Every structure is written in C-alpha cells, then in structure tokens.
Amino acid sequence: VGTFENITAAPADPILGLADLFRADERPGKINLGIGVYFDETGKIPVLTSVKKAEQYLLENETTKTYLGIDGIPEFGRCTQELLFGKGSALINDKRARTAQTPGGTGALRVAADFLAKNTSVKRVWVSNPSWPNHKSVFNSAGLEVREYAYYDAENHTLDFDALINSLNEAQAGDVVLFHGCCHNPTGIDPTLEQWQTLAQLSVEKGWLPLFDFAYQGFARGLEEDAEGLRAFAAMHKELIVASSYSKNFGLYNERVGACTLVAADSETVDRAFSQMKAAIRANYSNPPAHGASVVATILSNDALRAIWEQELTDMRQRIQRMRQLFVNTLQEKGANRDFSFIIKQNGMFSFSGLTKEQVLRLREEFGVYAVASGRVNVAGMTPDNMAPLCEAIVAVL
Amino acid sequence: VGTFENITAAPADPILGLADLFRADERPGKINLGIGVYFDETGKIPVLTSVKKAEQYLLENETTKTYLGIDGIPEFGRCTQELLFGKGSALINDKRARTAQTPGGTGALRVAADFLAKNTSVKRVWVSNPSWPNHKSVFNSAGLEVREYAYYDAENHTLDFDALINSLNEAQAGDVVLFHGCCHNPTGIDPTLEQWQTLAQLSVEKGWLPLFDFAYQGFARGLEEDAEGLRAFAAMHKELIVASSYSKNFGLYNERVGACTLVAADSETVDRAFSQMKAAIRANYSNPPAHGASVVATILSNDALRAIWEQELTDMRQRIQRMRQLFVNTLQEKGANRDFSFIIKQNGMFSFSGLTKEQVLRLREEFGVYAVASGRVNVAGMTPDNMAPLCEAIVAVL
Ligand SMILES: Cc1ncc(COP(=O)(O)O)c(C=O)c1O
Ligand SMILES: Cc1ncc(COP(=O)(O)O)c(C=O)c1O
C-alpha cells in the first residue's frame, strides 16, 4: 500500500494562487494587482540599472562559485546592520548583532522560527490581525503557536492603538511579538514614532521578545525614516530579532536575498546563540545563494553604484504615491460615491480597499481585474494606461 | 530573564568548520583536502566555461527578476527528470513524477523531510554508516528518527553487502531508506548493478520508501551509467523520492541548485502529493533562487553548451582518477608499507583513507594537511605540486 495514497491536496496559496489564475486568463485586458511586485509606467517588472551594472561586474570578475560560509557574505551582513541600525549604532560597536544571509525574507523568518523552537523556551508568537498570510504558515511549520492581536480599525481605516495594546496585554513574558517595520501588510498603516516608543517601553516592561518583519525599507518615507521604530526598540531592548528582505527595494524577487539578524545582551551571548542559528541553517539549505546577495553587497559597498540605487528606490516610492493620488481622483471621476481619501494615508505598495470577498471575486471573473481576496490591492500594479479600466470595474461592483 | 541566556553552544561543523581553521593557519604550504569542491591542476576552484557562457546569455536576455513559481523553472524540472530516469522513461510518459527546484541538494533533502513529516506516517529514516554527516541533521530537524545500517567493510575496503542486508532487517514497511545514487560519501564504494537489483527486489518486498541522494551524477562512470541504480529501483517501485544536486557536476556550489523529485503510482496521486510539497516550500523559503537553476537549464536545453559541459565533466572525472593513481604511486615511493591499492577502486572525489582521528589531527597540527576527522580525503584537492609534500606527511604519521 502506497505511502502517498491518502495525502490530502493542499489549498491554493491566496497570493501565489492568483498568479497562476492570472497566467491562464486569456482576455487581453487583464490587470494584475495581486502579488507584491513593482511595475513601471510601462507595465513591465524591470531590473534596476544598478542591479544590471552589478551583475555585469560580477560576470567579468567572478573566478569561483565555491561555497559561502553558513552565514553568507560578510560584507553583506555588515552592510545590512548599517541599514537597520545606523552608521554608528551602539549594537554594532558593542558587537551585539550577528547577521546571516538567508534566501529571502521568508527564509529569514523560517530560520528564526527553527532557531527559537529548537533552542529556547519560546512556544507562542503574536502576529497582527490582519497580516501577511504566510506568517502563520512559517511559524506553525516550525512548531510554534500563533496568536493574533488587534491592529486595524475597518470603520475608520486607521490603527486601533487602544485595541492593540489591550490585546497584547495577554502576551506573557518570553513570547515573540511580530512587528512590521514599515508599510504594514496589508493595511499600509504604520505606528507613529510616539506609538513605536509606547510599544518599546511596553515591550521591555512586559518582557516580550521583539521580532521585526522588514520587507519594505524605503517604501514609506526613506531608508532611515522607515527604521525609526526599529531603532527605538534597539536602544531599549537587550534581545531582538530582525528578518529583512531585499526582494522589493532591489527588485531581486527571484534571487531570494534576505537576512536574519540576532541581537543579544553582549557579544558572548549573541555569538553563543548564533552558533545554533548557523546549525539550524546547516540542516535546512546548508549555505545561502550567492548571486543575489553578491549584487546587493556590490551596490551598497560602492558609493557611485549606491547613489544610482538610492535614486531608483526613490523613483519607485514616488511613482506609487502618484498612482495613489491618481487612484483616488479617478474613482470619483468614474462615479464612485464612497470616500477613498484614506488610501492616500497608507504607506507601501498595497492598499486595503475595503472591497468584500464577493466584490473582489466579481472583479476577476467579470472584468479580469485580479486582487487578493482580502481586498488588498497592489498600487504599484496601477499605471496611467490601466487606471481608467481598473476604476470603471471597481465602480461597476460597488 | 534573557531568552538567549539558556542557549547551549553548538559544535563546529565537521566539514565546514574545517575551512575556518585552514583560513587561520599560517604555516607555509598548507594543503586543503576537506570540503568536497573540485580543484584544477593549478589548485583553484574554477568556473566552468559553459557556466560563464550561460551567465552571459542570461545577463543579455533577462528582462525581469519577478518571482518564480513555488516549484521553480519548468524546463529545469523537465531536464532533471530526463537525466535521472532516461530520455524516454515510462515514469515521464505516464506523468508519474513531479520535480521541484530547491536550494541545493540539502534543500531537496529538507523539503522532503518536512513533506514526509507533515503529510505521511513516516517516522523513521535509515541512513548508511558511514554517511554524509548532515544527512542525520536534516531529517532530525523535521522530527524524524534516524537509524543507521551497515555498509562499509573497513578490513577489505569493500561493500559489506552481507552486513548491509542483515542490518536492514528491522526496517519496517513505510520506513524510508536512503541510498547514495553513486559515489558513496565518504567510502566511495557503490553497489554493483547486480547488487542494486538485489536491493530493488528486497525494497519492494519489505515495503520501503526509497530515497536517493544524487550529489555526484557523472563523477563515477558517466551521466547514464551512474543512474543505473536509481533506474533499477524506478522500474519496480510505485513511489520513491530523489534529492539531486547540481552543485558539483556543474561547479555551481554557492548558487544552490538542486531538485527534489516525487514519484507516485499515477499522475493523480503525485499531483495531489506534490501540492503538499509546494506548501512545505512556501513555509520555508517561499520560492527558489533563479540564477543557479537558470544557468543549468540553459546549458542542458542547448546542444552547444551541453556538449561543452559534458566534456568539462569528463575532464573533471579524468583528472580525479589520475590523482588517485598518482596518490597511490607516490605513497609507495615515499616509503609507505601499508597497501593503498583500494584507493583506485573508489569512485568520486573522496577516498576513505582509513586513518584514525588521531592521525588526522596530527596531519593538521604537525604538517598543515587538512582532512575530515573521519579519514575522508578529497582527491580532487590533490595536485602534481602538493602530491609529494602530502604523501611525505602521511607516511610520517603512519
Ligand atoms: C511582510 C512581509 N514579510 C516577508 C515577505 C517575504 O519576502 P521575500 O519574497 O523576500 O521572501 C513579504 C513579501 O513577500 C512580506 O510582505
Ligand atoms: C551525499 C550528499 N548529499 C547532499 C549534499 C549536499 O550538496 P549541496 O547542498 O551543496 O547541493 C552533498 C554535499 O554537500 C552530498 O555529498
């Protein structure tokens, strides 16, 4: 009798599932606003010029593909800690942080979940409601329980800071509380610097272990501005974890470039702990892929090349703010009677449109407009050319 | 209290922790015979000509870095199944196999471990003794018990087929049994075609689930000849799993190019099971890195680059066999009384020298010769320039 005979088919991934549905739809006027990738005005998903130049350099100068260390390219780790904590942070001078290059932000999250479940007493992880759907899947797969805390006020399209704190009042010491560093997924609402500080002081008091999902650094306001909430926690805590991704701000989606950074009280504890993290990595993928991280390190290490990239990231952040403004205006022109001003106040690539599961489904089957079932819409998928058909289909469904 | 203060330090990797000590040693004339990478006569770890050719083609024709599917590049999986099973295998025509691109062979083993642990009643994995050390860590990370079965005859330097058969007597039906496709690591002794057939018949009678690990396809005799063992199993079994790697037969170590292939009774079953394998990938690294696998797919699907790659693989295999002969010859001329003729009969990059842990440590600290503590020596690291100092050191420690 076969071992695979009684396996149950898995449900479709709500995000990556739409990509295959979109790839099959034959209608020419399709619009893809599901998966979080950046489109330019042309509607293509380009490769950054800084990335093409780095790859050109690596092609002519690479002499070996020999294995990287378990934790990856050292310069990649040093440059990652500078972006997260600053040029002259105390965590760096005191040698309190160790970084491992991982295959994407998702890889950085699994590495952390494996490390925590196999080496600590942690067993419960708090994730915002709503949040990235894959957060639950990653932590559950590592054997950790996942609890939800309040976050979003649907009636006012704002952060419910009172419900959030009242919800986190149930998290005991030693628990992991997952925070979006910036551009919350899918709400696009981030705490203010004061709200961050309120959570930081509340975190050290109740004894939580902070863990920062940080996939959109530079898409809210700026590389440094988007890290204030994190750097407010880092100046107050003795321990914290940061899983970051370069897929978005470098357009290196399929190369899987990410980092998991440990912070401990001193250098002897972070190194001791980092040895078990390297062991959890060894038993997973052994060592990380070089090409994507090698590109990021090349860009950050070269001033002339970094300048090119910082501008390309700025152009991405602002093209989204243009489509965001244009989205709201065009809705009113096409006959929408609801108020969509709150979309202007949301950060990042997404926007919680407030559409229902039925309206979203109807947009796909009747108009070929593809969005996630939660009503999350990729603002970076909108262009001047597809804006009018996109808004006409939304109004027809309201 | 700190969440990390109670963590226990992990030991250095017996293979990767070795290259750290080698980098620190300052004795002039160090020799590295540890990690399993290929060196040329110069003593460097080169990039294959076909790989550079493919990387240039990709740099010119790549227009986007958008995410791959959970299971990776389609063409990569198609050409992977042809290499393993044959140009016109029945497994492929009957659509019984599904392949998933993974980060290296290690990633294929972890994806299978998570898949089996979360979706089947598999609770035990049988691995050879000796074996690649990381085998036990990968399956343990998923909560699977790992038993060992006999394999090597340390007296005759041969396969102890009688002990192998007897030690696998308590292997239940539905247990997993791990076989090295070819170039057994570290012994270098592979089953004969007659022995493969004997194991295939026994495996179907006992109800095992065979799991093949192919890290060195093409390094024993050839691409087709090295797959005879697998293809004997494939012709008789309804279900099996294959974790293959391109790190070494393509020289793409740090790009993490691997493949996990499911085989089931029929198309409907493998599809149902493969959907759960994609779910385990999504919860780990989301989707695989494109560059490495893209290089492999380009070469394999182009007769011009493929004929070049196949000749490069032959050149690597033929240099290793020449170093095997020179290694035994120089040991004789340098005064060794022990008979090392068995080195010739071993396939792959490694030769189980038969040295004790004490002799290996004495070679390292007294002569700067670095080999794994199990006595495993990388013949691919020997050169005409380091052969004599190397052999002098061994004779001194015998
Ligand atoms: C909040 C958040 N964390 C992690 C990820 C995963 O990033 P990556 O594609 O680098 O694995 C995403 C987006 O994919 C995300 O939105
Ligand atoms: C038997 C065996 N399996 C798997 C691997 C994993 O190789 P990689 O992770 O580099 O693809 C190796 C060597 O590393 C090996 O020798």
Numbering used by the authors:
A (entry chain B), B (entry chain A): -1 to 396
Give verbatim lines from the article.
E. coli aspartate aminotransferase (AAT) is a pyridoxal phosphate (PLP)-dependent enzyme that catalyses the reversible transamination of l-aspartate with α-ketoglutarate, yielding oxaloacetate and l-glutamate. Using our approach, we enrich the less populated but catalytically active closed conformation in order to increase catalytic efficiency (kcat/KM) with the non-native substrate l-phenylalanine, leading to altered substrate selectivity.
Superposition of bound and unbound structures for each variant confirmed that closed library mutants VFIT and VFIY remained in the closed conformation in the inhibitor-free form, similar to HEX, while OpenLow variant VFCS and OpenHigh variant AIFS adopted the open conformation, similar to WT. 19F NMR spectra at 278 K for both mutants showed a narrow peak centered at approximately ‒60.2 ppm that is similar to that of WT. Spectra of these variants also showed another broad peak centered at approximately ‒61.2 ppm that is similar to the HEX peak characteristic of the closed conformation. The relative intensity of the two peaks showed similar temperature dependence, with an increase in the relative intensity of the WT-like peak as temperature was increased to 308 K. Peak deconvolution and integration were used to evaluate the population of the two states, and confirmed that at low temperatures both VFIT and VFIY favor the state resembling that adopted by the closed HEX mutant (T < 288 K or 283 K, respectively). However, unlike HEX, at higher temperatures the alternate conformation with the WT-like peak becomes the favored state.
